[PDB]
Design a protein around this nucleic acid. Structure first.
Ligand SMILES: [Mg+2]
Ligand SMILES: [Mg+2]
Ligand SMILES: [Mg+2]
Ligand SMILES: [Mg+2]
Length: 85
RNA sequence: CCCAUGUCCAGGUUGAAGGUGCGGUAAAACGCACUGGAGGACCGAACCCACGUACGUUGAAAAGUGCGGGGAUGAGGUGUG
């Protein structure tokens, strides 16, 4: 949702202007992915939506790889905040 | 054969489901351990049955004994009424 995405940007971002950043993107994608996994458990047959789920997941994984390359401290802080492995 | 009401099955073993935790995952299938303790499951006394063999065969016995044998928490054995 737009209000939830606003909250997530304001929380995880470095500024109120820095809408775009890896931590911001990943924080949005994780909530979207949780909603989609619940939707999939409720709608097991919607493979057409599971595809977009996997695409979002790959996007998040690539962002996380960029973070592991550039800033390992930022990476670990992010993952402690989010709860990912 | 059945009704009701009771009672008996030394000991040991294996280790189903379920559960928990750790991996693995985007989350799961899944895997690894532990727990748990199922079974007309296993080995084997009493208990029950009678596979073989020898002997007995005017028998110890109008159907047995010995040497081994099968089942042994179940569709079990047994008691009283
Ligand atoms: Mg048995
Ligand atoms: Mg036995
Ligand atoms: Mg008796
Ligand atoms: Mg006979």
């Amino acid at each position: 949702s737009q209000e939830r995405k606003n909250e997530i940007i304001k929380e995880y971002a470095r500024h109120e202007g820095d809408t775009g950043s890896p931590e911001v993107q990943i924080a949005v994608l994780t909530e979207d992915i949780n909603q989609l996994n619940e939707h999939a458990r409720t709608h097991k047959k919607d493979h057409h939506s599971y595809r977009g789920l996997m695409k979002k997941i790959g996007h998040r994984r690539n962002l996380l790889a960029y973070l592991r390359k550039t800033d390992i401290q930022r990476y670990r802080e992010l993952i402690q905040r989010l709860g990912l492995r």
